Amino acid sequence: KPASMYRDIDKPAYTRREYITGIPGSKIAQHKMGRKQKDADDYPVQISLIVEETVQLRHGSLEASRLSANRHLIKELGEEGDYKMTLRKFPHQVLRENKDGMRAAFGKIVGTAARVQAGEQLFTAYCNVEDAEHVKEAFRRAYNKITPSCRIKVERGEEL
Amino acid sequence: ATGPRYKVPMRRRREARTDYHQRLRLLKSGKPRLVARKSNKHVRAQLVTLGPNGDDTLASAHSSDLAEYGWEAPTGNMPSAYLTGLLAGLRAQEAGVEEAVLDIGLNSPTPGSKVFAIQEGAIDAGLDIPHNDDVLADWQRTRGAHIAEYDEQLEEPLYSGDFDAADLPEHFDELRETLLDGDIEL
Amino acid sequence: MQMPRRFNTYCPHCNEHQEHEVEKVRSGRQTGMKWIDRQRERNSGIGNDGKFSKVPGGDKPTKKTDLKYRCGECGKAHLREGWRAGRLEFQE
Amino acid sequence: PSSNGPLEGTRGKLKNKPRDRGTSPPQRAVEEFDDGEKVHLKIDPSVPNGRFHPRFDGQTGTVEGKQGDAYKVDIVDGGKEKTIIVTAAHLRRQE
Amino acid sequence: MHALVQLRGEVNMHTDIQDTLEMLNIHHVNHCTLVPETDAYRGMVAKVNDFVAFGEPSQETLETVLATRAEPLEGDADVDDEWVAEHTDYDDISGLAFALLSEETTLREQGLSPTLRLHPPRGGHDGVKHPVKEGGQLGKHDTEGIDDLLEAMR
RNA sequence: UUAGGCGGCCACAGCGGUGGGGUUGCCUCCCGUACCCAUCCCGAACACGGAAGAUAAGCCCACCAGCGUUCCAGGGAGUACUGGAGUGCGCGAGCCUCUGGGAAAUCCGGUUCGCCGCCACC
RNA sequence: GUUUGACUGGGGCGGUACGCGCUCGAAAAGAUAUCGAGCGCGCCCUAUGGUCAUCUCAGCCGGGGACCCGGCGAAGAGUGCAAGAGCAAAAGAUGACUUGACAGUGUUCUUCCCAACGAGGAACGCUGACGCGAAAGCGUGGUCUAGCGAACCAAUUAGCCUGCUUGAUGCGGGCAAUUGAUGACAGAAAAGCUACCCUAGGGAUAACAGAGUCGUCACUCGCAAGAGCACAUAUCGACCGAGUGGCUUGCUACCUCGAUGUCGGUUCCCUCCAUCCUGCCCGUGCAGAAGCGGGCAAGGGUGAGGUUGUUCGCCUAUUA
RNA sequence: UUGAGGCGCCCAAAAUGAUCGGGACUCAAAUCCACCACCGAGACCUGUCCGUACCACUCAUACUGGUAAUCGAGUAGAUUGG
RNA sequence: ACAGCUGGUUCCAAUCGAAACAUGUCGAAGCAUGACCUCCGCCGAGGUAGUCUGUGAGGUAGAGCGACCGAUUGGUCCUGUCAAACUCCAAACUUACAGACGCUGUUUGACGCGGGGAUUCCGGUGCGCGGGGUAAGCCUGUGUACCAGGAGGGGAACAACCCAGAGAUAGGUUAAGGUCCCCAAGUGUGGAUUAAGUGUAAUCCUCUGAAGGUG
Ligand SMILES: COC(=O)C[C@](O)(CCCC(C)(C)O)C(=O)O[C@@H]1C(OC)=C[C@]23CCCN2CCc2cc4c(cc2[C@H]13)OCO4
Ligand SMILES: [Cl-]
Ligand SMILES: [Cl-]
Ligand SMILES: [Cl-]
Ligand SMILES: [Cl-]
Ligand SMILES: [Cl-]
Ligand SMILES: [Cl-]
Ligand SMILES: [K+]
Ligand SMILES: [Mg+2]
Ligand SMILES: [Mg+2]
Ligand SMILES: [Mg+2]
Ligand SMILES: [Mg+2]
Ligand SMILES: [Mg+2]
Ligand SMILES: [Mg+2]
Ligand SMILES: [Mg+2]
Ligand SMILES: [Mg+2]
Ligand SMILES: [Mg+2]
Ligand SMILES: [Mg+2]
Ligand SMILES: [Mg+2]
Ligand SMILES: [Mg+2]
Ligand SMILES: [Mg+2]
Ligand SMILES: [Mg+2]
Ligand SMILES: [Mg+2]
Ligand SMILES: [Mg+2]
Ligand SMILES: [Mg+2]
Ligand SMILES: [Mg+2]
Ligand SMILES: [Mg+2]
Ligand SMILES: [Mg+2]
Ligand SMILES: [Mg+2]
Ligand SMILES: [Mg+2]
Ligand SMILES: [Mg+2]
Ligand code: NA
Ligand code: NA
Ligand code: NA
Ligand code: NA
Ligand code: NA
Ligand code: NA
Ligand code: NA
Ligand code: NA
Ligand code: NA
Ligand code: NA
Ligand code: NA
Ligand code: NA
Ligand code: NA
Ligand code: NA
Ligand code: NA
Ligand code: NA
Ligand code: NA
Ligand code: NA
Ligand code: NA
Ligand code: NA
Ligand code: NA
Ligand SMILES: [Sr+2]
Ligand SMILES: [Sr+2]
Ligand SMILES: [Sr+2]
Ligand SMILES: [Sr+2]
Ligand SMILES: [Sr+2]
Ligand SMILES: [Sr+2]
Ligand SMILES: [Sr+2]
Ligand SMILES: [Sr+2]
Ligand SMILES: [Sr+2]
């Protein structure tokens, strides 16, 4: 199904699992990547992926953008490299689909999406100075797999 | 105490001094309350009405101000209790109070007890208080005949301070006589 | 539900509280001499009889209590408002 | 509404804030009001008896007598005049 | 004391806003009223802010406007110095204009219509779709700004 | 109020903590069961009778802020949201300007370890 | 001779949003719809009702998942049943007593916001008689909001009124009220077929077509994992993301029901490009030949046949 | 070397004849920031008249005088004079 | 014959001027009772469409959750997220009553009461807030203004977008919008950008243009 059906915040917040049954599991395998034993303050460089438009990003898009981002970091910095990436948004919004015409139209549960407001950090990676251009490329691949245009903003790093 | 949602009881409930449920049922009558309170050594009797910023006492009587009329005897007993009620009731009649309802507070409604004696005294003074005759003590126990027949089992004296030996409940009679007389300074 | 056969309650006849006996209202037999019985005979001819061609309707899932409260001293009965009870059994 | 009972949509107004929980103080339950007095109508969640229909929460009526211990308070619902039977526990004096 | 002028018509205007204008004695477009600066009156102009033009006028401008557009409570009659002398508590238009600005009296209290029925703006106004800060003619004006408007509506 | 009783508001009063206070006075703990009364068993409690002892409890007085709570300052924030208006911007979801209102979290610093009423009383 | 209901993104089938209660939807007063989301009621209880006395619960800790002692413990226990709400010297628990789950008659609110409408319901009074308690007081059933039913007729309860000139007897008529059901729940006693059909109307409403939409369908683009002996990008290409079209399908019910003739085919004309051939090009896993992929390009061409009504499709021989 | 902003470019395929209403326009006849002067309703201001309402006078609802910034659009429908 | 269904129902003018909603209905193409419109009589001094202040009611937006509740990360306290049916908090705002100002009423009698007559119970659209639906010139709410039943001016045309609410006639000045021609008014002024005919398109079924890319 296209994202055109779910990308906008046009419906109420539908998260309450005590009233909703049959919710498909999240396709997101990991949320804490790289070296999850080390601290975020132990790194000199902190670069985040900032979403420019207020959207709803599905669990399938989150997994696709996370996979294409972390796979590049595993390719360039190694499987046990000196970095740590975080996906801070979780898919709370439960999604429906009306799949009888418009009669009894309340749709059955088909998926989950993450409500991300404009200006928010979806991804945040902490790396060293020499690995900074490899992570900007991981985010360049990650923004092509989500709905809005994005900013790759450097938060802690006057090393240029 | 634990957090924002914690419910701390009302102050007089926290202190375990006022039974708020009994208080409402008491205040429903519209009549002033005959507050009958006790202590180990003394007995109190107040005529309380309802006020805007708190309760208003119109006429009180403690068993300590009983000696002012000629009571050389102890203050935490049955004869003392009646006389403290009679003294409160008479001061009430001079204040314009005609009727009342008995408030015993956290004390027990035990038949023949001191709080019912405080009530019998206040009724005898001229106050109209809703009562029950068979819940009150027999006239002789109110006199202190139970204390005199306890002094009959002597060997060792009951009272330490010198008042008398075999005890005089005739002092009760000599006190009710003084209070029933209208010439008295209240 | 359970109901006491004998109990103290108000008597509207004696104007005071007395011990009443509870009994279920037994259906009194029909005479067949009332106006409606005479109308059934008169208004019935060839074809449909209108109201007299109708057959008795259904039942409610639970009926109300149909009781008689008989006074112990004066011996007179009174009726009360019934309440929905699936079964009504008496105690003693 | 899904149902048209008296306590429909009254989760908010007939519930207390956790600190205002428990039995209410007797002083306001025995308060005496005179005829002509303007009184605010608000149900005390802790007091079960002597309540009015929740639709009238927030009204400022005029005491026009009493029925037993409860009061007869005159209000104007929209354009219609109504007389409400209400105890002091659910009333507060204006000003 | 502020000078209110209606610049936007009644059609599609909220009823509670149209009713406020009618309470402020202003029933037609280009009609002006002299409103005192009180708490009650401040709430009223704030409600009408988007369909009006207001501000404190100068003694000079108010005098010009009263001379040309003031009318009695009933009738055609010119409100000149001689009229003001014979019917008001003042000597000339200046004495009336001063009292109004200092909030000592009102036009009605002095036997005049509360409405100053102005002429359309000569050379036109700055527009009825934008406020003063955006280059339009709606809302609060400067004393120099309201004067230009009232003088153009002689 | 050199310790009491009845209260109003019902945490600004809660939780926790330190120090001080009682010869015929007060409140207590305390001492004791012939009685009124009492325990589905216990004078523990309730009830009654009483002063050998005590200030250790409670209670009353003075005080501490670590937790909870109330209010205030400054910061967050005139931000978030928002009533009225617009031939303002945006493909659009949406945003912006003008006008009238205006948070919450949190951080720092203050406040708060009850206030008030009636009565009685060296 | 009649009946065979209504609701409904046309109708039927399904369902009941056909009488009721709760939360949310509902936009912080009130009111508020959809075949809106979550889910209930058509009872049950003589105590599971009423009062009074005594008392404090979940859970956890410590000492001897039954029991016992102590401590912490405002409430997470319990309170018949949905949900939301109320309750701690109680509205909960235990114990004892008790029958107010009483008769009669009202006021008011609700039902039905505003704003008329019945039955039903609730709150709050009075009169009578009672229960409990020392008493104030509490008890008009269950802590609150669901558990309900007209007229006619019958049965039943207590007293009384009345039946044609009159008295007696029988048997009737009535005033007040209880019980018996109509769930299509403000109450008819009630099954279907019609392509043999008929009438009134409707584009208030379906089938074809138009129109809107674009999930579906077709086509494209971004990113490029992957494989392609090594090599992402000769070639193939997942996930995900962004779109264009208006050929498929679906949705809607705007237009036409006083009719805009339904599929397929044929014949004749015009057009579109997302190009199958033909012209000119770029790349190649381009030796050549034959290909694969891509670009410009709509001038012209794109044919004959076997099954099938077929569109579609399968098949044959020809063909640039 | 890197950051930000403005306008534009690529992405961008449809059926009888292309389009911003057309012509056409390029230091504009575009866009953005300011500014100047004008054109332009039945609105607003103004002369006269009409109706309606009300006021004064009146038997009058006949004249006459006065007031309306706060009267003058209207389907179904109610009312009234001709 | 009956029909709750379609069609038609003939002269002029003046005043006021709807409802397309609620309750019940074998009711949904119909009625009744309310709402609302109009007319008459009564009453006789207040009224309340706006604002301000005071005394009250409220849990939506937002926010937050070692504040309940239930969702929802990882590490050896720290670290990562949420809620239509959560709330330690909390607006704007809506709302009861009262006072004040405003407006209105006491010959135009308001507020209110009683009575006669209706029409109406297919609505639509814009905007704000919604709920369903991929969406819709979709379906279904709500507040409001409008079309319906609203002329005239502008928008190429075009019910509801902008100006504007309108007796006749006449002069004048503006509004929206516009001033190169068609076409009334500028080939106006100061300055800058754009080379694509971008653009010369407020709103929109109607005016597209996206992610991505651009020495
Ligand atoms: C169900 O199909 C029909 O009933 C065909 C016909 O009966 C043909 C009528 C021909 C006449 C008699 C009018 O000459 C008819 O009235 O058609 C309508 C009709 O008759 C005028 C025309 C309609 C109306 C919309 C356009 N469409 C074209 C023809 C048609 C074809 C259909 C159709 C409807 C229409 C209607 O159902 C699917 O096939
Ligand atoms: Cl005591
Ligand atoms: Cl029975
Ligand atoms: Cl009520
Ligand atoms: Cl005429
Ligand atoms: Cl108008
Ligand atoms: Cl061109
Ligand atoms: K047709
Ligand atoms: Mg709510
Ligand atoms: Mg005038
Ligand atoms: Mg001009
Ligand atoms: Mg202009
Ligand atoms: Mg000490
Ligand atoms: Mg736009
Ligand atoms: Mg049907
Ligand atoms: Mg509401
Ligand atoms: Mg019948
Ligand atoms: Mg029967
Ligand atoms: Mg019905
Ligand atoms: Mg009904
Ligand atoms: Mg036919
Ligand atoms: Mg149609
Ligand atoms: Mg034809
Ligand atoms: Mg091509
Ligand atoms: Mg060709
Ligand atoms: Mg006519
Ligand atoms: Mg006329
Ligand atoms: Mg929110
Ligand atoms: Mg119409
Ligand atoms: Mg010209
Ligand atoms: Mg163009
Ligand atoms: Na179906
Ligand atoms: Na006959
Ligand atoms: Na309370
Ligand atoms: Na001590
Ligand atoms: Na039927
Ligand atoms: Na009723
Ligand atoms: Na289609
Ligand atoms: Na498309
Ligand atoms: Na054909
Ligand atoms: Na070609
Ligand atoms: Na073939
Ligand atoms: Na008309
Ligand atoms: Na018929
Ligand atoms: Na109907
Ligand atoms: Na019909
Ligand atoms: Na006034
Ligand atoms: Na919002
Ligand atoms: Na309708
Ligand atoms: Na209109
Ligand atoms: Na036009
Ligand atoms: Na062009
Ligand atoms: Sr939506
Ligand atoms: Sr993107
Ligand atoms: Sr016969
Ligand atoms: Sr027969
Ligand atoms: Sr049945
Ligand atoms: Sr002892
Ligand atoms: Sr557009
Ligand atoms: Sr788009
Ligand atoms: Sr401010």
Ligand SMILES: [Sr+2]
């Ligand atoms: Sr269908």
Ligand SMILES: [Sr+2]
């Ligand atoms: Sr009850």
Ligand SMILES: [Sr+2]
């Ligand atoms: Sr059948």
Ligand SMILES: [Sr+2]
């Ligand atoms: Sr056949």
Ligand SMILES: [Sr+2]
């Ligand atoms: Sr082409």
Ligand SMILES: [Sr+2]
């Ligand atoms: Sr070719």
Ligand SMILES: [Sr+2]
């Ligand atoms: Sr076909």
Ligand SMILES: [Sr+2]
């Ligand atoms: Sr086939």
Ligand SMILES: [Sr+2]
């Ligand atoms: Sr006219």
Ligand SMILES: [Sr+2]
């Ligand atoms: Sr007219």
Ligand SMILES: [Sr+2]
């Ligand atoms: Sr609201």
Ligand SMILES: [Sr+2]
């Ligand atoms: Sr020029």
Ligand SMILES: [Sr+2]
């Ligand atoms: Sr220029």
Ligand SMILES: [Sr+2]
């Ligand atoms: Sr079109």
Ligand SMILES: [Sr+2]
């Ligand atoms: Sr772009």
